[PDB]
Amino acid sequence: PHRRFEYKYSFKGPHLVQSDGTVPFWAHAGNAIPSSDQIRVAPSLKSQRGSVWTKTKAAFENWEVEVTFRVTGRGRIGADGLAIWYAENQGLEGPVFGSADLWNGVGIFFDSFDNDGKKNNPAIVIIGNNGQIHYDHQNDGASQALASCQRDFRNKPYPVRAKITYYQNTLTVMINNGFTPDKNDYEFCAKVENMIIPAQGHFGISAATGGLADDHDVLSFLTFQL
Template sequence: MADAVTKVYRSLPSDSLVYLKTLSKSVCLLLVLCVLLGSSSADNVYEMEEFLKREYSLTKPYQGLGSSSSSHWDLMGNAMVTPDHVRLTPDLQSRQGAVWSRIPCYLRDWELQVQFKVHGEGKKNFHGDGVAFWLTKERMQNGPVFGNMNLFTGLGVFVDTYTNEDKNREKRQTGTQRVYPYVSAMLGNGTLSYDHERDGRPTEIGGCTAMVRNVNHDTFLLIRYIRSRLTIMTDVDGHREWRDCADISGVRLPLGFYFGATSITGDLSDNHDLISMKLYELTVDKTKEELEQEEEEEVTVPRVDNMQQFIVVELEEGMSGVQYAVTALFSLMGLGVLAAIGLMAYGRWKEKSRKRFY
């Protein structure tokens, strides 16, 4: 076999030999690059594991969850622990449950990876309401916003499985129509209210559709906060790859807030299961100016720079084209009448002035 290869090699023209030598060098270089990239990827995985913050993470067998003094997480409401998950709410009406971290987070750059599952017996449009993940100033507060309080201070990321807003009204006012389940983010400053009738659209800073309900594969959510940039990604297709969901720059989050997960059911219900929450501290190369700015700038209230970019201009409900035309016509007539009255008044004033001086 070797002799046959040698004969073929020697019978080739000189330019072909040069081509083969070049090709073999390229193949060798490609193999070396693949090895280096493979080792680099392995190093990155190991490095990420090194920065896993266990005191802010909740994983099986959920030993840090409970009422003991050594626990890092509190259980609340109808939530219960099983060997495989923390069930925030069962598939029953009027239930709500939560888990909240006891330790405030003082990390500036972090990434939260959540594995969860939403499933139930309800058919299309007969299930609800969803699950939410939080980083807020307040903790352990029952409320209507996916089981948490309204007027919260901090970040809320909602996995909404049921639409409350009238679809025709939504399309008429915004020009778009969401497909549910839907993931959205909201930044609360203690005064902003979550609008249930409109599924939080007026205060949403970003979001995407994510088909998470009653699937046979694992579903994940990633929330990353780095250099004042909030990024949300999903992995809900069973392909084990992250897909972009929202990317918002200029997000300012204070330190010392608490992570949590909550859920609620009403007339409609689902099982909302939390499988794991893993928090990673991210190391970022920052300039001297960035470090000095972080030390000098003390953020006390969450905000988004240039919030104007998130304001949606909407038309008044119920104003048809005919109504706009009639309104415009009467407005013009009114302006004409006012102009005529003004001219008459000016003429009389001018006539009196002329009589007074002459």
């Protein structure tokens, strides 16, 4: 399928922030810092929350987003992680990787912290929510996991990239693990067949820390109409 680039639903450096400290076409909040070459969505401080969400919504039947980020920290263990969002509502402030709960749409969670002691982290998680569910933080949503995989996205020598495609009721998630600089060296993570999400919504990106804390930096969020 063809791809149209949707600038109104995207950001990136090298001039990522406007002179007034704002990110064109996106609203940012919590403790997220825009800078010219990346947004530090949540800094390596205790109990932090940040989000970046689009202003306008976007009416796209099928779409693709490529997200480049780094999640850096001293420890071989870090927290709390990072979430990419499509949803009917801006979830700016909230307990869900810095974003609002009760979301209407999908959310892919890069979870640095093994909260339910299963030695199954860091991990990528897909979760549907129709407006009335509650994210099982302490259980890393394992029960609500529409689909999921296990890649270690922390502390890589090139930045990690997550391609996230929705084509004909099938959300797909490829991931490039920061090992090569081939921005297209993706590998399979997961997939959800027969999925419906709001006709128009906001795209969003958020992160958070607590007891443990990493820097969560998103260098670019690139959106495609297919």
